[PDB]
Design a protein around this ligand. Structure first.
Ligand SMILES: [Mg+2]
Ligand SMILES: [Mg+2]
Ligand SMILES: [Mg+2]
Lengths: 54, 95, 109, 52, 287, 127
RNA sequence: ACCUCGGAGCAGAACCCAACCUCCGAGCAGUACAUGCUAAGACUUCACCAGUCAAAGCGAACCUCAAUUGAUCCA
């Protein structure tokens, strides 16, 4: 099918991927009472040390 | 607590509070669960997994712990290889 | 001479009535004996509590009860019935809302 | 009637876990799971902790 | 402004015209009258009206929240942990662009304090600055920094652009003299010698991978070459350009300031430096 | 200047020259390095696999076969990284992917196994 | 006579509901030794503390009972 798209149709082949919907998390609270400490990681998006104004 | 000491006239921290809790700079107090090292032979592993967790505190528990410590304990701390350092700033709240 | 009996209410019953949107893992209803049975996309805990296995809408139906053949209590309750007699129970279903993912274009190689 | 004993792993050692067993029956040997070896390994009971 | 032109037509501002900005002064509430005081806000007679409510944390007799909970060492050795103020490369590019830190000189910790780029306080046990990889892309500066800790990616971002990083050590005493040097030269003491790291930190500052100031200058080209291979930049040789004599200068260990030596007494007043010539002092200061 | 006991001329006396601290496989002029701040960035190294002189010919065949799903229409091996906010760390991730491909090339499946075996059981049909 | 925990009635149908109110009980036993490790989402005894349920995952196979219990400090 690589041969079909490139050779005789003369176009780049399209490649698809089965994308699942993003996981539901509830609305983040100020005081996440009794949740574990992992709760703050459900709501972050970078796994790298941010340093702020410094 | 002591609101005005007799030597300095300053507030004092309650040292029980420091000995048990962890203040994150955003205002969240982290604690350990009560009984996490008691009678483990009669607890189901789900429950033991629940007790070995670092659990956040309530709003009023948080304000009670703020009033019982002083501004030294509320301060930015740039430690070297701090385990809790990624949990100080609060990411991505929409209030 | 009547000591005891000071236990409080268990706060059981239905948490998600019919029509309610439900995310995966929400407890639908906690019971003490099987008042409601798990139907489609509904799981059961050790405490006979019905939770949800998909995101969707809770529906309650009435279905034919046919127990597992290794369940000698209910199976012995079957064989005592007359020839037309069919047991029903009320079941809880979660009708799943979303598709479980889409195909999306990634790259024009 | 029962005893809470500790079970010491024979390999991947330093790993214990506690069990119940009767006062009267023999000293337990089990096949528990070591997460240090990450295998199932024989454990042998070494000390009774508390007679529950 | 139309507003001074308003001030023409108005009577003169005096001590009889002045008035606080409305909103500044909330009015004092005091317990007199029908509303502010009959019970005066204490309620009915109990223990909270009498004035004797128990201490903060007392839950009336059940074991309090802040005591039902196991002691765990979150804060166990808090005042002996070392702290390092972050200085991002975004921040340092920002200081170089606005003239506050001159990159044609060595950037010691005094130059980051005098440009007011970084505020470090030696009490509260900051042991100095750590470089931080934030802003590594879009960091375009040839610089010579002496920073007490540095991540690999920050060393890579400096050494890409033709820079030099080294990681020095400072005692609390030494760091305190480094940050604010002028209130030390009014103290009258001779310049001390900075101490070597403790045993926890000697394996840090003797490694060439993190550019230790006690490491070999014979293992550095291997480490510079390794980062240049890892992060995909061709390693420029610092030897060619004209700033090389500037980009080579380090102060040795046991030297706090740059051009000075331990044991000297800076006389700020008549602008002299008194140097000792006794042999015992020279054995002690050049140790 | 000032030199104490712990100067680097005394701790390491074998390396005493000033030039000793500064005297010095994939070539980067060959690769095409492109960026897109798609939150992470996204580095993208592409290079034409056929013309790559700095990879051996059998290793170019093993790469041309195993990683054929990365190869462009124009014969360019294209490989990206969006694992970091810093484009140094994404570029390093891409180059490490390349070095991993050359080292591995020099020296769910189950369902497809069964569906192929049954497809060969229906292939049992001759003229 | 009692003091804690659970079941039933009161309290008929979501939840909750007292009494020196009416009746039963509990303070274990048995089996297993992956009764491993992790983790979305929830319930919750009207607070807190405690309690419960749990998909996916890694690793493996191919728990019953209602209650069946005890914080912190200290050892
Ligand atoms: Mg009752
Ligand atoms: Mg009650
Ligand atoms: Mg509640």
């Amino acid at each position: 099918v690589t041969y079909i798209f490139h050779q005789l149709l003369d176009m780049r082949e399209p490649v698809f991927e089965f994308v699942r919907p993003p996981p539901y998390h509830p609305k983040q609270k100020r005081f996440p009472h009794r949740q574990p400490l992992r709760y703050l990681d459900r709501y972050r998006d970078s796994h790298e040390p941010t340093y702020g104004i410094y | 607590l002591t609101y005005f000491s007799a030597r300095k006239g300053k507030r004092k921290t309650v040292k029980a509070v420091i000995d048990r809790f962890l203040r994150l700079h955003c205002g969240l107090w982290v604690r350990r669960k009560a009984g996490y090292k008691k009678k483990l032979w009669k607890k189901t592993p789900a429950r033991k997994k629940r007790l070995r967790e670092f659990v956040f505190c309530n709003k009023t528990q948080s304000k009670l712990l703020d009033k019982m410590t002083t501004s030294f304990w509320k301060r930015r701390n740039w430690y070297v290889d701090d385990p809790y350092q990624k949990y100080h700033d609060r990411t991505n709240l929409k209030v | 001479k009547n000591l005891g009996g000071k236990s409080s209410g268990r706060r059981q019953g239905i948490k998600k009535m019919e029509g309610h949107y439900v995310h995966a893992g929400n407890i639908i209803a906690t019971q003490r004996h099987f008042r409601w049975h798990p139907g489609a996309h509904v799981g059961v805990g050790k405490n006979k509590c019905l939770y949800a296995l998909e995101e969707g809408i809770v529906r309650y139906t009435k279905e034919v009860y046919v127990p597992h053949p290794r369940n000698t209590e209910a199976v012995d309750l079957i064989t005592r019935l007359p020839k037309g007699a069919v047991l029903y129970k009320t079941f809880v279903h979660v009708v799943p809302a979303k598709p479980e993912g889409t195909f999306k274009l990634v790259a024009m190689l | 009637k029962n005893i809470l004993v500790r079970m010491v792993s024979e390999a991947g050692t330093g790993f214990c876990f506690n069990t119940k067993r009767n006062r009267l029956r023999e000293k337990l040997t089990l096949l528990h799971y070591d997460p240090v070896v990450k295998q199932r390994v024989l454990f042998v009971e070494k000390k009774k902790i508390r007679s529950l | 402004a139309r507003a001074l032109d308003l001030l023409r037509g108005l009577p003169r501002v005096s001590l009889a015209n002045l008035k606080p900005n409305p909103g500044s002064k909330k009015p004092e509430r005091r317990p007199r009258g029908r509303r502010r005081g009959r019970k005066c806000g204490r309620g009915h007679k109990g223990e909270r009206q009498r004035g004797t409510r128990p201490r903060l944390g007392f839950e009336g007799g059940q074991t309090p929240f802040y005591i039902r909970i196991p002691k765990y060492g979150f804060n166990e050795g808090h005042s002996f942990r070392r702290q390092y103020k972050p200085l991002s490369l975004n921040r340092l590019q920002y200081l170089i662009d606005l003239g506050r830190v001159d990159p044609s000189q060595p950037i010691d910790l005094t130059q980051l304090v005098n440009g007011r780029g970084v505020t470090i306080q030696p009490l509260k046990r900051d042991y100095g600055v750590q470089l931080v990889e934030e802003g590594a892309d879009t960091f375009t500066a040839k610089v010579n920094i002496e920073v007490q800790l540095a991540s690999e990616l920050a060393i890579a971002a400096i050494e890409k652009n033709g820079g030099v990083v080294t990681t020095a050590f400072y005692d609390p005493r030494s760091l305190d003299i480094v940050c604010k040097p002028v209130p030390f030269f009014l103290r009258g003491q001779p310049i001390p010698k900075r101490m070597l790291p403790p045993e926890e930190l000697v394996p840090y500052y003797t490694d060439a991978k993190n550019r230790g100031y006690l490491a070999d200058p014979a293992k550095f080209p291997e480490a510079r070459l390794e980062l240049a291979r890892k992060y995909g930049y061709i390693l420029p040789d610092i030897t060619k350009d004209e700033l090389f004599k500037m980009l080579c200068t380090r102060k040795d260990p046991r030297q706090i300031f740059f051009g000075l030596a331990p044991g000297w007494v800076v006389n700020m007043a008549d602008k002299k430096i008194l140097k000792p010539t006794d042999e015992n002092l020279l054995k002690y200061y050049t140790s | 200047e000032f030199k104490s006991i712990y100067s680097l001329d005394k701790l390491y006396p074998e390396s005493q020259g000033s030039d000793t601290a500064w005297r010095v496989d994939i070539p980067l002029d060959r690769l095409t390095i492109s960026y897109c701040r798609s939150v992470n960035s996204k580095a993208e190294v592409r290079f034409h696999l056929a013309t790559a002189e700095w990879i051996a010919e059998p290793v170019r065949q093993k790469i041309a076969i195993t990683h054929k799903n990365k190869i462009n229409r124009l014969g360019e091996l294209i490989l990206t990284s969006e694992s970091s906010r810093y484009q140094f760390r994404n570029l390093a991730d891409c180059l490490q992917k390349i070095r991993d491909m050359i080292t591995e090339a020099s020296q769910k499946l189950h369902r497809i196994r069964i569906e192929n075996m049954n497809r060969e059981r229906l292939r049992q049909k001759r003229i």
